[PDB]
Design a protein around this ligand. Structure first.
Ligand SMILES: *[C@@H]1O[C@H](CO)[C@@H](O[C@@H]2O[C@H](CO)[C@@H](O[C@@H]3O[C@H](CO[C@@H]4O[C@H](CO)[C@@H](O)[C@H](O)[C@@H]4O)[C@@H](O)[C@H](O)[C@@H]3O)[C@H](O)[C@H]2NC(C)=O)[C@H](O)[C@H]1NC(C)=O
Ligand SMILES: *[C@@H]1O[C@H](CO)[C@@H](O[C@@H]2O[C@H](CO)[C@@H](O[C@@H]3O[C@H](CO[C@@H]4O[C@H](CO)[C@@H](O)[C@H](O)[C@@H]4O)[C@@H](O)[C@H](O)[C@@H]3O)[C@H](O)[C@H]2NC(C)=O)[C@H](O)[C@H]1NC(C)=O
Ligand code: COH
Ligand code: COH
Ligand SMILES: *[C@@H]1O[C@H](CO)[C@@H](O[C@H]2O[C@H](CO)[C@@H](O)[C@H](O)[C@H]2NC(C)=O)[C@H](O)[C@H]1NC(C)=O
Ligand SMILES: *[C@@H]1O[C@H](CO)[C@@H](O[C@H]2O[C@H](CO)[C@@H](O)[C@H](O)[C@H]2NC(C)=O)[C@H](O)[C@H]1NC(C)=O
Ligand SMILES: *[C@@H]1O[C@H](CO)[C@@H](O[C@H]2O[C@H](CO)[C@@H](O)[C@H](O)[C@H]2NC(C)=O)[C@H](O)[C@H]1NC(C)=O
Ligand SMILES: *[C@@H]1O[C@H](CO)[C@@H](O[C@H]2O[C@H](CO)[C@@H](O)[C@H](O)[C@H]2NC(C)=O)[C@H](O)[C@H]1NC(C)=O
Ligand SMILES: CCCCC/C=C\C/C=C\C/C=C\C/C=C\CCCC(=O)O
Ligand SMILES: CCCCC/C=C\C/C=C\C/C=C\C/C=C\CCCC(=O)O
Ligand SMILES: CCCCCCCCO[C@@H]1O[C@H](CO)[C@@H](O)[C@H](O)[C@H]1O
Ligand SMILES: CCCCCCCCO[C@@H]1O[C@H](CO)[C@@H](O)[C@H](O)[C@H]1O
Ligand SMILES: CCCCCCCCO[C@@H]1O[C@H](CO)[C@@H](O)[C@H](O)[C@H]1O
Ligand SMILES: CCCCCCCCO[C@@H]1O[C@H](CO)[C@@H](O)[C@H](O)[C@H]1O
Ligand SMILES: CCCCCCCCO[C@@H]1O[C@H](CO)[C@@H](O)[C@H](O)[C@H]1O
Ligand SMILES: CCCCCCCCO[C@@H]1O[C@H](CO)[C@@H](O)[C@H](O)[C@H]1O
Ligand SMILES: CCCCCCCCO[C@@H]1O[C@H](CO)[C@@H](O)[C@H](O)[C@H]1O
Ligand SMILES: CCCCCCCCO[C@@H]1O[C@H](CO)[C@@H](O)[C@H](O)[C@H]1O
Lengths: 553, 553
């Protein structure tokens, strides 16, 4: 017979489970609903759901009250929302975590085997009619086609929000500390254990690699003076296993902590900046605490970077992206009264979703110059030629591409996009609509409703055959993005809960760690409480260039 | 100069930290106190501490109101206390965890390197005058001496509480799933990652070993019919790496999951019982869910054992030990409204403390027989000779030894005790009094006050030289135990917070997992909600023998 859970009968997070040979049961426990399929609101949840506004409307508010917001922003009405935005958002992420590439059910292995990435929704039963479930054509769209047909850039549609490459790279850099798939174990697994903001894209993702990177003196990290300026050490002085092209492995071949940070000046640039900082903070610490050994002058140094990072990501990175008028704010105490699990676990769906590849331009302008991908990718001399300062002032000026709308992934990288959908299929992630539900939204009723226009809409229908079988990565990118937004609705509604759940789920964010001692002295704490993007740079440089997550003017 | 943190100036969990060359600062953040050394209660904490009764008195209540308790026990006044006993107790355990053998400060490594055991109090600064801190003789008592002088059994003083060996073994068995030190990395480290009740003393502590133990069919574990009865499989059919003596490795040499469970009939016995059960539950599951594969019919099976175990430990194991009249109760929902981190981490201090070796008798009586250690230890034929039933009915009758008072560790095992203090010294655990404080008690003012008598008291003084330099393991065992208690005050006051913190900190105990689906169907849940000791046995046997954590009559 037909595996009954192939219809995804259970609603509102109700657990589906086969009983007997052809029967099934929903586990609406705390679902907030009662009944066979979890579709009977309890008195309260019914109130909640009736007095509950459209996610589309709440967005409207967050982006319109120039005045109401300038005022809510200068009063406590600020922390109250921030504290609200947090709790509510991250409450949609299961914690402890639930499934993986190998388990569509609760399990101890899933719980303890860090090796796995995790999922929010189970997978599409391997024995279901359609590869998506029950609806659609028994053959998903020719992956490579879709990619060129709808995601392939034509004319560069830039981010209406003012985003720039200075942001794009940070995004990339940052996201790699937790997103690290291995061809070894394959899709659905991850090298970057720890999951989250641990800077294991700096200090490396294993103890050894760290050590092989640490200068084991005054708690700093090795490095080298090239032109007077500081830079990461070369693999000739640090045996860290990199991925550079069989070229001049000795010099110019730097060791960073993130195996791939050599394939792009941006990622190396940043890797540099942070490293610059790290040692920079060591200098600071060692003064307040001379007696301090190497390890302490290292652990404390690290943590201060987890602070500054988690800090910048929310109050500036997230800010720019969101476009909200409400001043996002990083303050662990906002949850000290809430029920929250201080632990995160990267999710495959989060992974796929964070693919902002369309942010990347056509070419990379650096002042009067104008490097092509070919001359940019794997390039080397560029970082140490131009110098941090000037090379930042360059990305802080060249605009980023719009993530939403569709058709904006440059052809060079366009290959990625295809492997995402290919992998998405590997993993067996349920359909867009199925994920729209779990993140508090309604399923799109028609392809037309999904995209502002009618062209792609129809063409897409004569492919998947039903809005209900649309895929995850395609729908996210192909969704009519918000008015003047950098990307569609579903992007933030699905993105936020993952991002914050893990952004604040970091141990340092808990009451147990959030103390001045955890950063040895006030200086440490105040560094985490004062981190700026403009500071991460200008404090570790010779000169202060223009720097921001958005183009000037 | 003198490392200022050698006096342990900071009070109530205040973090001590060197500033400059000879200065220090206390971090009373949320200490509940303000000031230089954290000794100024805030309005509230001052109320709390004044309206706060003696721990010695609360014990008095929990052990006296025959009537008041029979009534509090039959009403909600029960869950309210149980829910109170939990929260309050486990609030004394840092979570996320704090230090290790290598870090006397907060650190990311400490956070993520599961390899480490963790500590509550930092260590005794390696550069302090006395090896204990500031007070005492610069030479700790000759370890081996103490052991024979005060802990070495003379006349067998049995547990006044009625405890039996049926309990003693469970205690041992159970505790080894999280206590597994390696000579490899050495003291302060642990093989048993996962920390806590994961039954990694059954399913093994690594994926491989599990697999090599799993019969990969109908989700059961391999086994062998010896005399009609089921038993663990031999290493001849399961390559699991054991520790048996170079004898008859083929037969009689069983594989269990806990490398050492062969060195004692009790531990093997239990290993058997549980295994019997596991498969037993598989049979049950597979009926409710035939479609279910191997992995599911295994993970679900496991979890049901984590339930039944966590269950029995609290409502029966803990019960007997405590001696309270309040009916301890296992119900995860009692914390669903509290702020609690669903994660535990074994602590070196917890380790040392759980050494109830004095529970072990002089000899082991099995009916009219009466085996000597020599003929009991590493014995083999015994388990399969007598049979579970009869061999349980034997331990459920022979009394256990009193853990407290002092002088009760049989000579054969008496060697252990010496390595505990030796290791305690290896680790550099602060003095008893220092630990008495952190667990809400007052430091003993004199050696005399510590032990009911005056003999040991004085003799102990002309050794350590000050009650303030007394050690951890010695003080715990040498403390005047409560009136008719199985052990002293400090034992429960320090034991409980660790035991529950981790007993309920198990992922299954959280709202996210605590659902009937996590055990596939109600049957699973009701198994966890109904686990008895009398059932773990009699349900997996031919006959129902006498079984309990205390001797009959
Ligand atoms: C998290 O989970 C992943 C995935 O399970 C772990 O990685 C994977 O680990 C397993 C077991 O180590 C690997 O399985 C393979 O199994 C074959 C078959 O074994 C053979 O058949 C039986 C086994 O029951 C025996 O009779 C034979 O002697 C023999 O063992 C084996 O041949 C392979 O060598 C291998 O062990 C799997 O290859 C491995 N890789 C992945 C990603 O799938 C991962 O370790 C775990 N993480 C942790 C830390 O626990
Ligand atoms: C949790 O922490 C423990 C303890 O740190 C980890 O185990 C330990 O890991 C370290 C590093 O792998 C081992 O250190 C030893 O270091 C010596 C010295 O290295 C040499 O000197 C420098 C290094 O900077 C180089 O120039 C040389 O080439 C050379 O590397 C090395 O010789 C030893 O082989 C070893 O690496 C330590 O031995 C090891 N064992 C313990 C328990 O101490 C543990 O892995 C970690 N857990 C996890 C999963 O991260
Ligand atoms: C917003 C983050 C971000 C950015 C800006 C970015 C920018 C760029 C970029 C522009 C210079 C280039 C040439 C690439 C190129 C690649 N990226 Co990304 N990637 C990003 C996030 C990712 C993620 C996430 C993965 C999947 C692997 C992982 O880390 O788990 C990825 C994978 C890849 C792969 C491997 C194959 C695949 O999975 O499809 C290539 C090649 N890329 N990427
Ligand atoms: C309450 C639990 C309990 C019991 C009943 C128990 C009963 C017995 C027993 C009686 C038949 C014998 C002969 C032993 C013998 C030993 N035990 Co235990 N042990 C127990 C808990 C432990 C712990 C805990 C350790 C330390 C190692 C670890 O597991 O981390 C231990 C270690 C040992 C060691 C290794 C050296 C050392 O650390 O001192 C020997 C030998 N033993 N034990
Ligand atoms: C629960 O959801 C399932 C979705 O499959 C519903 O499906 C059943 O009812 C259909 C009519 O709406 C029948 O045509 C299907 O044969 C039948 N399928 C199944 C799962 O057996 C089911 O009615 C829903 N129940 C309620 C009360 O809404
Ligand atoms: C790598 O990037 C560097 C930029 O630093 C390129 O540098 C050279 O080429 C530029 C234009 O092609 C010139 O304007 C630069 O002056 C020149 N730099 C010098 C003086 O060495 C380099 O060509 C790029 N190489 C690749 C991989 O294409
Ligand atoms: C804080 O605790 C320390 C414990 O060492 C106290 O010690 C100081 O005061 C002593 C008198 O009680 C002096 O004799 C010591 O030299 C001095 N030691 C130190 C640490 O410098 C200190 O007074 C306490 N402070 C308070 C207000 O109680
Ligand atoms: C191991 O324990 C067994 C118990 O099963 C011992 O069994 C033999 O010895 C007993 C007394 O010493 C006899 O009463 C038993 O009948 C006898 N068992 C049989 C019939 O084989 C055995 O001697 C012990 N061996 C060790 C290690 O001392
Ligand atoms: C990281 C990648 C995508 C995240 C999407 C939105 C997150 C940005 C700011 C947080 C608040 C958003 C909200 O909660 O509205
Ligand atoms: C495990 C080893 C020692 C534990 C000591 C006491 C725990 C027993 C019952 C729990 C409630 C005790 C309390 O909270 O009073
Ligand atoms: C009286 C409360 C303040 C004014 C509320 C104005 C609501 C505007 O309406 C909003 O317009 C959006 C346009 O993008 C739509 O997407 C939303 O669905 C709609 O709620
Ligand atoms: C500046 C000249 C035009 C006046 C409006 C400027 C933009 C801010 O006008 C906004 O209009 C809202 C309507 O939704 C009001 O509710 C807000 O209080 C107000 O800040
Ligand atoms: C003026 C807005 C104040 C803060 C409102 C809540 C901020 C987060 O926003 C809400 O998050 C929930 C969790 O994903 C979703 O169910 C809602 O759709 C979303 O609008
Ligand atoms: C004959 C030996 C049978 C061994 C069964 C082991 C099942 C392990 O489980 C497998 O793990 C993989 C990676 O961890 C996942 O990708 C698979 O979906 C899952 O079935
Ligand atoms: C009126 C409240 C109920 C009766 C309270 C009786 C208190 C008995 O007193 C208790 O006796 C114990 C004897 O072991 C001592 O250890 C305690 O310190 C003491 O508080
Ligand atoms: C059984 C004959 C003697 C009477 C007392 C029996 C034991 C129970 O007596 C207890 O005494 C307490 C005093 O602390 C009362 O507070 C309790 O309510 C009562 O249960
Ligand atoms: C009648 C008793 C009702 C329950 C009282 C609380 C149960 C736990 O007991 C209390 O735990 C605290 C944490 O370790 C300690 O500070 C106290 O000394 C201890 O008595
Ligand atoms: C010359 C190379 C210097 C390497 C310094 C590494 C310091 C690691 O730290 C050490 O770890 C040990 C086990 O993990 C602990 O037992 C030690 O106390 C701790 O100092």
């Amino acid at each position: 017979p037909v595996n009954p859970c192939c219809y995804y009968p259970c609603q509102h997070q109700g657990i589906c489970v086969r009983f007997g040979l052809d029967r099934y049961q929903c586990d609406c426990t705390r679902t907030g609903y009662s009944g066979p399929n979890c579709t009977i609101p309890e008195i309260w949840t019914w109130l909640r759901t009736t007095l509950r506004p459209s996610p589309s409307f709440i967005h409207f508010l967050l982006t319109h009250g120039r005045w109401l917001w300038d005022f809510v922003n200068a009063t406590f009405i600020r922390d109250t929302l921030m504290r609200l935005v947090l709790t509510v958002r991250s409450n949609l992420i299961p914690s402890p975590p639930t499934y993986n590439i190998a388990h569509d059910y609760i399990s101890w292995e899933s719980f303890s085997n860090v090796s796995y990435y995790t999922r929010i929704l189970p997978s599409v039963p391997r024995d279901c009619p359609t590869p998506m479930g029950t609806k659609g054509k028994k053959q998903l769209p020719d992956a490579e086609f879709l990619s060129r047909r709808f995601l392939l850039r034509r004319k560069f549609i830039p981010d209406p929000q003012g985003t720039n490459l200075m942001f794009a790279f940070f995004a990339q850099h940052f996201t790699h500390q937790f997103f690290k798939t291995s061809g070894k174990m394959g899709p659905g697994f991850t090298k970057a254990l720890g999951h989250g903001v641990d800077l294991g894209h700096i200090y490396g993702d294993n103890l050894e690699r760290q050590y092989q990177l640490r200068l084991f003196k005054d708690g700093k990290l090795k490095y080298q003076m090239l032109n007077g300026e500081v830079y990461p050490p070369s693999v000739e002085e640090a045996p860290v296993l990199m991925h550079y092209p069989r070229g001049i492995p000795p010099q110019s071949q730097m060791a960073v902590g993130q195996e791939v940070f050599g394939l792009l000046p941006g990622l190396m640039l940043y890797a540099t900046i942070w490293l610059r900082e790290h040692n920079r903070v060591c200098d600071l610490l060692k003064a307040e605490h001379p007696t301090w050994g190497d390890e302490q002058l290292f652990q404390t140094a690290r943590l201060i970077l987890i602070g500054e990072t988690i800090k910048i990501v929310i109050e500036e990175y997230a800010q720019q992206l969101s476009g909200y008028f409400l001043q996002l704010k990083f303050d662990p105490e906002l949850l000290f009264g809430a029920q929250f699990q201080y632990r995160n676990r990267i999710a495959m769906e989060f992974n796929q979703l964070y693919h902002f590849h369309p942010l990347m331009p056509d070419s990379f302008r650096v002042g009067p110059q104008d490097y092509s991908y070919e001359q940019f990718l794997f390039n080397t001399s560029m970082l140490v030629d131009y110098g941090v300062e000037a090379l930042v002032d360059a990305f802080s000026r060249q605009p980023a591409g719009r993530i939403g709308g569709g058709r904006n992934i440059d052809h060079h990288i366009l290959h990625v996009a295809v492997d995402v959908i290919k992998e998405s299929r590997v993993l067996r992630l349920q359909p867009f609509n199925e994920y729209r539900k779990r993140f508090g939204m309604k399923p799109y009723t028609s392809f037309q409703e999904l995209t502002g226009e009618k062209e792609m809409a129809a063409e897409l229908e004569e492919l998947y055959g039903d809005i209900d079988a649309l895929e995850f990565y395609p729908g996210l990118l192909l969704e009519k993005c918000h008015p003047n937004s950098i990307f569609g609705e579903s992007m933030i509604e699905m993105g936020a809960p993952f991002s914050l759940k893990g952004l604040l789920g970091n141990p340092i964010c808990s009451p147990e760690y959030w103390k001045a001692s955890t950063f040895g002295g006030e200086v440490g704490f105040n560094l985490v409480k004062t981190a700026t993007l403009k500071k991460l740079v200008c404090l570790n440089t010779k000169t202060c260039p223009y720097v921001s997550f958005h183009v000037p003017d």
